């Protein structure tokens, strides 16, 4: 219908003064130019019942025309070994061994390990086609020579595969052998599995120089231009310790390799140990070590799963940092993307007099308007306002390109996520084609559900622009930091401000952010938790690539569940599932935490008997005690909706917490989260169980500070209702005018 | 300063009182609008080969999760052929029942008497 | 009500020929005699619609009359330190330091560390009374001397408590300091917690010899008679590494002990390190090491929770075999029981001519008749029958003394579990008074729900007497083993038999039992799985005490959930949650596995299109192909009910498996298990979801073997329907007449 | 022995076909014996301040968990102020809807027609 | 033989070079210990009169470049003598507080790095038998040890 013709992304989410952000734009075809100009975002939701879309143009050193061009995106996980001198193409015999686990053994043609050119049929490769393992060599003149396995592969079974080329007998060979044990495969030792073969064909040509890189989980597309080898036929599933020899192996050698014994350790040409570099800090690196001393070090591209269950994994250890000899596999999905690697179009250095707020680069193509959001910080070590707003960028990466048609209202930016999956990537709420959910996500790709325009739930950036619009419609003076900046800077960022407001959906945190919030509130600090599902999942930012996020989920409010031995993060060797299971529940920091969720509409708040208290006479200052709080708004038509938090002393709510109001009129579609169920039994729904509620709370910390928790998502959505004159806005304004004073927050 | 544990109470109990209030009102309205659920429950209390009404299942979901559900056990011994209904030492009752379906329906009637006899 | 006036148990569950069992019996008061004889259990269920009770008395040497007597039982956990020399009763100044974490701080008088006599108030103790920590000395003349803290204790907050006695100034002193960090306590570092005190009082008396042992988590009742000290006032909560000094401390030294620094190492008298012994295979012992080198070694009594989170726990390692220095706490519940420690009344040596079957001992008091079930094996290394029937004793210990009235139809045995809790113990599906689930359960105690006599819920051992009566009424000759024996021996036990049947509810298995089943089926074995929920929880038998079981649960079909740091077992360090999370699900071995559970009535089976297959016409032989398999029965009123297993290829059903039937007409009360839910939406119920079903399967294994699963608890309750003339008994009789023949099993 | 992965299939799909057959019969009997839930969904599809009937809720539970639920989206653009029904490039319908509540009731009616057409 | 932390900062926005210097001795790594009254810390600055242009050479650690890169080879001339632990280039001007935090080993501003060579990336259970120096910033500016410096030295 509408044809999205222009894209783009930043290299980094937030930029302070005096440093440069680079914008990487692409179009569907190379013709024409595109406009660009900087704007300041104020209100994102273009709902006709609300304030409407609001922006503000900035005279900067950015505007002008730039050449539109199409930029190709590599798409799929693999391991690329740089080989300029063609050492991995032997002049005589050679042999290849690897371990194999396949999730989609019948999805087209899939290359496993290769130094292959595909435009001209030259080099060697080990591949999967017609559900069989095929070992092919070629000369460059189109003629090939293949040997093909007899027994096809089963899905998700560990195989030991040995491809053998032997010019002395002019004979190719291929030894396939299944290595299942009790724990590592899809089924166990009770099957009469007959999946072994030993075949032979006739080598009629000689294997030439492909002039490419050696690839694991892929075939090379064409010859190497500018040192980049494009990968086409991607593999789906684990590969464990490949190796190339310089001699034709026998059946006894294949049998000894299939038990894990390194035969002829001086005849090796290369041996890539995928488990080399696992310390007590995980393995936060992309360097694949050549474990045979030849300098053929690889490099993981588009982030396959480091620290995955190997072929020899009995389940006596499940933490991969304490048993690295059983975690030598990499998953290699066909549809990963951590960086588009695009070439730069224009860059922008932040000037001196530029206020810290939300910005965007508005790119105008022919008939398509596009935005690229980013954030501008206060200058480093300075605090130009008494209010800080934490943009929840880790949850922006969580729901980035959250594809629904690939997985209900749709705009034109959802059918383009569906029609072009190779340009955009997937989300952590989605899953791969294999059945495993997506763990790694990334900023350096065009996030298409982040653009500010377009009754149900809203995307996460307009849901924070609700708070930005409410702060600009009043007279409050604020700054903007992000959760990456909170992660990098600690509580030193938070101690420069009086009150710190939290974004609309701060669901995924790091451990260091939780430590920063606890150290800030513990020593005379103030905050507003204007949201819910507040600190549920544990994220770790990748240490080499700070634009790559990681989450490995478990049971709970999930969409996917991690496979059994693979709970521990690879960026740090720590457990990291949900926060509540690490004895760090959300109530222990912010006073309330996750209780229920659902998807139809919102409720309203009924006041509790602590509303009439005189310790909180400053909160309920202009509200009659017979009124509803948030009955009607932009998000569901209410203030308590879609996800709810509760008060619980056993999970760690501080003892001096007052309980102001609570939400009612929730449908039977609101379920109890699986963390609170002992035995599931009927009646675990909203309106029928006590745990389905929101709870507006307040506790006071030491040294004159405290915390206010509204415990619902749609609270920010119901701020502009009835033109800023409602109970939600007056309550938020009362608490915020109390917190930005110089007197201590009351007890 | 948070120094004494007796100065602080569990403040969610106020919400539990409010919630039980509204829930008791809704259940007595559901019973007084559909009185045939007592006839249905006297017919077959286990729901054996006739799954209950949605309103009767809503009544059972209210009954099977209160803190007051912990009363009303059906008691019998090896040499009686009789079912008596205990009430929390437990206070055994007077009426004897020859099946446990009659005892379960009497327990259900007595829980309806309890939910009426509070508000 | 009827008053049960006789009890009893066995030392060990299973006894072969030529070896001796002991029977330990107690009465309400010491008078009279009790008769006794041996019976043989054939049926247990006295439902009038069924075959009724059946037994067969055996003439043996066992019968006679024996005097009845009352036998007191020690109940509750403690650490006992024997001191005959009164070395831990110092003459001059002494100090006591320990870390404290109380879960019921206001529940009566609780002793933490005492060498105390309570008949005459002599010794010293460090007790909790009236919610405060009280350090009292005494001398036996009644006149005591206390010091009482100012700040009371919060619930589940780590404190550091120092009790100092000083004769040089005739003064007691008490110190107290909270040592909370971000992770170990109930609430966190955001609270303004003032719970620190340093008080003192004058000492009027001298701490004299108490003539008792030293106890951790308890006081002593009277003087040590026959070398045994009766603990009375039981603490409830963790205690991390207590120590006694031989000199009076100061506030600065108590401050340095409160940071974990061992001050004055040469002046220690005793120092029990609760984490000394943690290797790479847990801490499978009861021996508590004196880390001061004096030889005051401890002894854990009634099984406290080893491997628990200590005072300095931060969540970077959640496995105690790899971070043993943050795991030195024992939980000390007031209501544990691992052994009754009763005196023997009479023993029994199994003669050579005695068939392997279920037996019992009919104790006959004045007006009370009781049973003690034990098992009899074949002679060691031999087999007397082709059919082996495993009696699932680990799941008997699972629901041993399962209390509902303390937490529905009740007999007079449940009001004794309510009326005498201190004689009977708890189940693993119960919860402690702390609010935590019971991990450790034991055979050496009277298990009251194990007796064969007495719709909605039929007990475990009568539900195996169903299968025993079905095999006795037909012509089948069988032996009987237990799951303890299969743990002890392995698949060598199973390979002596042609076919191995499985009991009514085989829910709790060890890891080695599952290895034995996969090794038995993997080579020519045959098995029937006439049950459901069959390999759900990992269980480990204690190595020193083979009558004590252990299970630590997580989110599943569970009564409780383990606290955050404490998932790994203490008897071996391995993870041990549920078998599905270890890549060892039940479908990988038996073909089917847990899908749904409910609690009202049962359903019937409907034949799938694989019933009319000509490969498996030998199963559905005398059954019209338009019938209903299993409608009506003694459990629920149908065959497929109360817990269900389903076919699933993704969890690991063998690919050659047939799907012969499926259960229908389930209520809306049958919920889907929490293991299969990503986002809980409404309609996760029976009749509204495709996971609520049972599945009757069959698959062949190697070397002429097979496996047949019926996927329902109430399959065995339908065998004795319509006086052994129905479809359930004809199907089970077809497959059992097939599996005991000498041709290989069909494919 | 077991040697070729195409000889063996998922035999649970037979039971999914059986379950879907009985499930479609049950749902069309619910729709035919209760013709007021269609007007109930027309008046308020979101259930805003009036939660749905148990039979309407059962029909909603049937629709929202099909493998064929992933058709019938509600497409828009930033320059329309109208709503069209996408149908699985998707292929849109023709009739326009000024509010999305009309679009949701159109999707609901079209799903009732789809469950009637398959029997 | 004293461990220092040296930060060189170029700022065109104020036309100013800056240099920071701080000794990071502990009890064990240096020539003398913590008993000395060591004042060897400075924070100075000068005027950037010119612009840093393209040198048309490789980047070297422990050396200067002689002339332009002819046939892809750069001749190192002025050789350093001593240990160098993990150098890094940022793409922005630093301050004294950020140089203070780098001088405690804290990696400040991870997204703003241009290159970060980690000389201990590759140490397995069989030493570091290679010449390949890993860019720990994820940009692909991988190094190459020339004429065999001493790997596995104290940091």
Author numbering:
A (entry chain C), C (entry chain A): 1 to 407, 419 to 465, 469 to 761
B (entry chain B), D (entry chain D): 8 to 95, 101 to 131
E (entry chain G): 156 to 310
Excerpt from the publication:
Certain bacterial species from genera such as Paracoccus, Pseudomonas, and Alcaligenes have evolved to use DMF as a sole carbon and nitrogen source for growth via degradation by a dimethylformamidase (DMFase). We show that DMFase from Paracoccus sp. strain DMF is a halophilic and thermostable enzyme comprising a multimeric complex of the α2β2 or (α2β2)2 type. The active site consists of a mononuclear iron coordinated by two Tyr side‐chain phenolates and one carboxylate from Glu. The Fe3+ ion in the active site catalyzes the hydrolytic cleavage of the amide bond in DMF.
The mutants Y440A and E521A were catalytically inactive. Structures of these mutant enzymes determined by cryoEM show a loss of Fe atoms. In the EM structures of the active site mutants (Y440A and E521A), the interface between the large and the small subunit becomes disordered, thus suggesting a role for the small subunit in the substrate entry pathway.
